[PDB]
Structures are given as C-alpha cells and as structure tokens.
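Researcher: Can you fold this with 7AY in place?
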Amino acid sequence: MVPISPIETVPVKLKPGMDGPKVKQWPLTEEKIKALVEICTEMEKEGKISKIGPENPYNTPVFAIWRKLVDFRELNKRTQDFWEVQLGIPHPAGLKKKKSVTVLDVGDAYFSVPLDEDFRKYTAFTIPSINNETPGIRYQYNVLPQGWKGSPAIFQSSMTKILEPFAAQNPDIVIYQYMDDLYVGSDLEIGQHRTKIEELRQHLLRWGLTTPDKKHQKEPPFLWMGYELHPDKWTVQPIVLPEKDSWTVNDIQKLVGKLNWASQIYPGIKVRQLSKLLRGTKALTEVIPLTEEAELELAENREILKEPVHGVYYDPSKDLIAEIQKQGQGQWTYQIYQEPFKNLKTGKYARMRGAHTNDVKQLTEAVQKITTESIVIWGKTPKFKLPIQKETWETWWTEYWQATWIPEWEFVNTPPLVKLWYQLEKEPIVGAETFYVDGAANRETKLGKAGYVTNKGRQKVVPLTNTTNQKTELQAIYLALQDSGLEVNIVTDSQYALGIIQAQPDKSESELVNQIIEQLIKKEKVYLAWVPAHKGIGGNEQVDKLV
Amino acid sequence: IETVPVKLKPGMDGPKVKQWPLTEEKIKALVEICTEMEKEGKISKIGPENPYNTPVFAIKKKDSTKWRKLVDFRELNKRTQDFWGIPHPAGLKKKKSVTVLDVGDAYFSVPLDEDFRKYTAFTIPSINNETPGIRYQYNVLPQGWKGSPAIFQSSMTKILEPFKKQNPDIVIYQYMDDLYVGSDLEIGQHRTKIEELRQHLLRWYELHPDKWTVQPIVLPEKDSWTVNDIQKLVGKLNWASQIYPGIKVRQLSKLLRGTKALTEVIPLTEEAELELAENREILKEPVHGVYYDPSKDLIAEIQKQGQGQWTYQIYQEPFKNLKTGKYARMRGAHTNDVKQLTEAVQKITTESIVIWGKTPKFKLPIQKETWETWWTEYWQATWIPEWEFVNTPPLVKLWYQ
Ligand SMILES: Cc1c(Oc2ccccc2OCCn2ccc(=O)[nH]c2=O)cc(Cl)c2ccc(C#N)cc12
Ligand SMILES: [Mg+2]
C-alpha cells in the first residue's frame, strides 16, 4: 500500500466566551432510524466518523430526508470567523483563449480533508435508538462536515497548498481554482494536454484526491453560474421573463435582477422605469401597474433579448477599449471590446440619487465605474471612447471647483454628444443691464414676493402663494432672466441660489431650476454676483419684497 | 532581539478590511517583493484560521523606479492600544531647514510579538478572482504601524545618542517610518551632515520651515472703485468679521446706495476710506485667542483655485485657523487635478507632522468615487491621513485668494 501524503489540519477554535453546541435530538421514525444507522455505519467504515463514549456533553441534531442531514446551525453560530476568499467570481470575459481546456470536479471534497482533532468533540451527534430503550448511538466527525462553517475555507486552502508545486513545475499550463472544481487550460497540443491532465490527477491522487476517471463528465459547452462557456466565445444562459397581468414587488425584484444579469452581454438594457416602482418596498405582496414608459421599456428589453449575442475572450496582446453612450434620463450604456463589433462584455450605469446634476459628472462617474470593473477583470484600465469634445472637457475641468480626472480617452462622434449648456462670466459685463434681485416669504402664511430693480429703472415685484424663501429667491433670478436681454448682470443675496447655479446643473428635479437653466441656455453672457443680505447695500431691496 | 507584549484596546477585535483591486503590474511587484520578504523571514504565509485582513498596494517613491510596498495600517492603528509620551519638539518648526529620512528598513530587525501577528494579516489579490489571494502575516515590526516606532523608541535613542551628544543644536524628531532632522546650517553642510547621519545609521527632501509662515487677509488698493469692486470688498469684509471683532462695513455699504451699473466707477468718501483703513489695521493684527488643543482633531480644508494653485487652512474650531497656506508647486501635474490634490494633501500632512506631531483630517474638494479610484497612483508617502468629501461648493474660495 503506497502511503498517501499527510494533510496537515487547520487549528480551529470557537468564538471567545462560547462553548460547543448542546441541542436536543429530534424524535425520529423507526424507518429513518434504520436508514441513519446504515448510512452512519458505512461512514464509520469509511473513517469519516467515529463512535464516542458517554463523556462528550456536546450534541447536534440529525435528520433523514435515504440521506442524512446534520444541522450544524448552532455550531456555526458558535464557530470562529474564517477567511472567505469566495467574494467575487471569475468573469468569462476575463479568460484568455486556450487551445485545450479540462474541468475536474473532485469527488468527496470535504470528506477527503481531515479535521482538527481538538475540535472533533464539538461535532458530536446522536442517533435515537428504537423505542429509545437503549442509549442512542453517539458519533463524532473526523473530517470536514457538510454544512459546517469552516469546511470551504479549509478545503480550499488545503487544495491550494497541494496544487502550488505542480503549478510551479508547469508554467506552460494555467490552473484556476474554484470550490470543488479545478479548471486547467493550455495552448499545447491535445495529446500533450491530456497527458498533463493525467499527470495532474496523478499528483492529486498522491494526496488522496479523486477526479473523474472516465472521459471528464463535463465537456463544452459548460453551464456554470448562469454562464454558457463555449470554446471560442461566452454568453449567458437563456433568459426567462415571466409575463403576468398582475405584478408584485418580489416579481419586480426578480425581473430587475434578471435584466441586470442579462445586461452584461446584451447592450441597451434599461431598468429605470421598473426600478422606480421599488419605492416604498419591504412589502413583497402588492399589485403595481406599469406606465407606457415601463411597458415600452420591457417591450424593448424583449426586443433585444430576441436574438443571442456572444462575447469573446481576452487577448493581452491587443489594446483594451471601452466606449460609452448616453441613453437619457440618467442612463448610460457601455461596451468593452478589443476588436470592433466583437465585445468582450457590456454594461450600464444609472445616475445616483440627487436633486441636481449634469451630464459631464455622470459621464465621469461612469468612467470611474468601468475603470474599477476593468481593473477587477483584466487587471488594467482601458482606453475610452467618449461622446464629448476635448474642448468641452477642457473647459469643464479647468473651471470646475472640484478636482476631477479621466484616464486616456478620445472623442468618438456618436450623438447625443455631452456638452456644457451654459457658462457664467468671470467678470461683470460692460453695457449689460444690472438686475438686483430679491425674494422673501412668510413662514406662516406661506405668502411671499419675488422681484428685481435695475440700473435703467426697470422694476418688477410678483406676489406668490404657497412658497418658501429659497423658492422666492430662485423665482427672482428667473424673473431677471426672463425680462432681460442677451447679456445681463445679476446681483443676488441668496447663497442658496448661487450655490445651485455654481454647481452647474443641466437638469433638476425642481421645475423652477429647470426653467432657470432653460433661460441660461438662451443667454449670450451672464454674470452672477453675490452680496450679503441686510447690510444696507444699495440696489439690494429686501424692503420691496417684505411688504 | 526581545519581543515586547502588545495587545489591542478593550472590546476591540482585530481589523477586517476589504482589499481593493490592483493592476497587474502592481500585483506582480507585490508578489516579487513579498516573495523576497518571505525568504528573509520578515513575513510568513497563513491559513484560513486567520479572519483578519489589512489592505496593501504598491507605489514608487521620489527619484526611484523601484516598486515599494505600502500597507494601509489605519484601521489597525486606531484599533491598536494607545502607546505611552514624548513631548513634541516645538523647536523643530522654528528651525531653518528640516530633512526627512526613511528609517523604515531598521524596523525589520526587531521581531514582533507572536500573539499579535495574526492582526497584521494582508492579502496579495488576484486578477479576475481566478485564484485565491496570497495571504501573509508579519513576523518583524511592520512599516506603517504606529506601534513600531513606539517599540523602537529605545533602540533609536541608543543609536542617535552619540550624534545628539555631538550636535545639540540639531533637533531630531521621529514619526512613523520617517526621521525629521532640523538645523540651521548651509545646504551643502546640511547635505554632508545628512550623509554623515545616514552612514551613522548605515553602520548601525529639503524642506525649509522658515520659508513657510502663516498668512494675513489683504484688501485691494485702488485709485478707482466700481460697484462690483465695492460689493466684493464688502462681501469679503463681512466674511472676515466672523474672525476679527472690530470689522465694520456700513460706511462702505453707504456708497452702494441706489441701483447702479456694476461697472460704474464710484469715488470713495472720506468716511469710507477711514473705515477701510481701520479694517486694514484690524486685519494686520493676529487672531484673538487662538490655541492648540492636543485632545482635539486637526481639520484641513483645501480649495482649488485653478492654474495649479491650491489654498489650504488647518484649524480645530471654525474661524480659528492654526495654519494657512497656498500650494502652487508645479511638477508634472499640469494636466491632472487629482495628482495635484494628492501632492498637496501630502505636503500639508508633512507640515502638520512637523508642527504638531500628528496628521489632520482632510476635507477634499473631490467626489468620493474619483478620489477613491485614483489617489494611490500618485501617493509617495509612507503614512496615510484621514479624509472626507465636501460635495457643496464653498463661497469662501476667492476669499482665500
Ligand atoms: C473550462 C473553464 C475555464 O477554462 C480555462 C481554465 C484555465 C485557463 C483558461 C481557461 O479558459 C480560457 C477561455 N476558454 C473557456 C472555455 C473553453 O472551452 N475554451 C477557452 O479557451 C475557466 C473557467 Cl473560470 C471555468 C469556470 C467554470 C467552468 C464550468 N463548468 C469551466 C471553466
Ligand atoms: Mg434675499
């Protein structure tokens, strides 16, 4: 008998101040009892478990569904935290094309790795005997229990430790490690590849690890985590979108999820009109009708999901390119590719929740997102094609009060183009009329006034019902814009309005702000000045709107 | 050669912090570096029984193409117990010149307490989550940890004892992996003395604090004023009245009476000139009752002025500035705002280390996502400060210009 290489155990402790689980064993039917006796008998014969004396105080409930089921929930609540490296999963668009690829799923994953002996006593459980007229049969685990908290991390770490030297000795092949599965790839000939696979499973056999003996049970195309993996290409598993005349919140959540999942390879997927209905959630039962925008949106989603689309694999020798398009209503879509018309992958970006915003900022955010994603997937930043002129970006970042940056990029002309809709003057305008504006509202009656006086003698005061100070101060500026020429100076005392306009939104949730924007767009030159209120500054007339 | 026992603060578990994605070259750099460090016993691979993780990335210091490894020990530092205290050398900021040295390599000789090592765990990440990240823990004193210089204080004292006994006029301070050396010599004599000190440290960044000072509030001097000019002046004086007690603006505001054009020239009255003069005299004096509190956090605010110019203020209580300045230095950063801001934050932090011996909390004029995405690409410093993000444009911008 050739000795299998020893696998060193990982020391495990319970959370501090906690003791091993003591839980009452559930009453079982005689049938279930017999079944569990047989199963645990064969397991004891296989060395997976062992009979223990009465000494062990700890116990775990076992069930029968025959297949046994040890409910380690309490022990999991009492077991220490582990390092889980499973955050994130390999994205198909990140893989490099290989001439030959093999998938190996190790049988008896957790039952092949030994458990730290000093912890085994906490994995104790008992089988109820017939009629409970004899002491129940006591067992403890000797290997990693299925359903235990620490099994995946320990198994994976062990697997890595075993795999390291073979990988070191074989640079001409690449091995990816994922749970109970290994993925080997190479650009070698098919015979040499199969040979090296045999070598690998031999090397694994030395430590006592079993891989499929037959022609490996999985051959292309591979169905894995919602993905379809083909030799020259990748895509997603076919879409299922339920159609019902009555929709619930949970159904909307599922639909949104599936659409988002589909959007990584299918370009043009939109999910705004369906996500707007998820306000006032946490009630999973409800009936929410759809607007024409939402119905047309879902119809367009069915229009795109009509025919299959494939992404390609990654080639390090070619540049990485991301191209962005504006979709409207804070929606953005992007394609990542190397060769034209052959996308590595796709995606979308939705603007955050805010009162005001402009296109350039959203574009910047989209670039940041795509950048992070690309660093995750290919380990590099792609070159960008953006629907914005060099001059526009130049003006923006040079005059923006915040610091801002975009990596290497070039202008692609594919309308709608992102532009700066208006620009304020840095200095007062000569020959332009000077509008001193002001607004004020009564806190109680919600009645207010907004208006202006100018250097040429032009005046106006408008009375307003149901309004606030900020609203009147915005309204005043709006009035000034309405009744003035192509060039105008405007003096205000509102830090609020000045703050809003200095943020340079091209769009807002407040109709008044939007109308002010629309007024700014029609203007040639606008200088917006600010003064302190109630300082007795001439021309600034709080008394004209306080009446 | 003897490990000193180190614990954490009561009721605080070790740091668990997400490792952020790294580019391929940074990952390869870290693999090479950590392999070499592993061969030298400085670090060791660890198993899954270690839940704790601290972030790590790669940089390139000044005048060097060699990749350096940097560990973000912030969370561990704030979770590490307080180490007790050497009073800050208030004469260090009063010296003519100060040179900063990297004494980090000296920390790798001293072993780290065995029971504490599991808290200094970090992970070299993989591209596309293809393989599990390489996990390490430190065996010796890690650079970036606040406990390392505190432990090495005795050793450093014993090493720098002869040099101190040699030149009593040279102030020596220590912060993290950096050693600050203040003197009043000549730049040549300075550099030679620094070579002497570094070879003295071998066998075992010119910064001039006098050229930097605080800054006053200045008002324009004009022969002719416009309505716009006077409006801006009144605005700035009104702002400054939050800092200086005796500021009054009624006589100047009296000039703006009526609705005039912004470009119209207004002759000053004698009362207005008098008031303006009084305001000048007031502004020429320092600020009343401005003190430093070691128990309070230092706050730094930075404004982008444009054309590579940046202004900043260090304070604790609002309108009580401890320091003000203007970073306008241009090196290779012409086309990049984030690089400028990063270098500015670094310089301000350094100044703060020299003056008070602790780093300030920043308020950056940048979106969180942008900064978070790009700041590590331009960061040459060994330490890291705390920061937050101001999303609303301040009006005081041109009031600090
Ligand atoms: C099979 C395979 C991989 O394969 C690779 C393994 C190692 C290195 C490089 C690989 O792929 C490069 C790209 N590629 C892909 C499929 C193919 O048929 N040909 C090809 O060239 C890589 C991954 Cl993440 C897989 C994840 C899940 C499953 C399943 N079930 C199989 C996988
Ligand atoms: Mg007002």
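Model: Folded with 7AY in place. The pocket of 7AY (ligand 1) is lined by residues A 90, 95-98, 101, 103, 174, 176, 183-185, 218, 220, 222, 224, 229, 231, 313 (CB under 6 Å).
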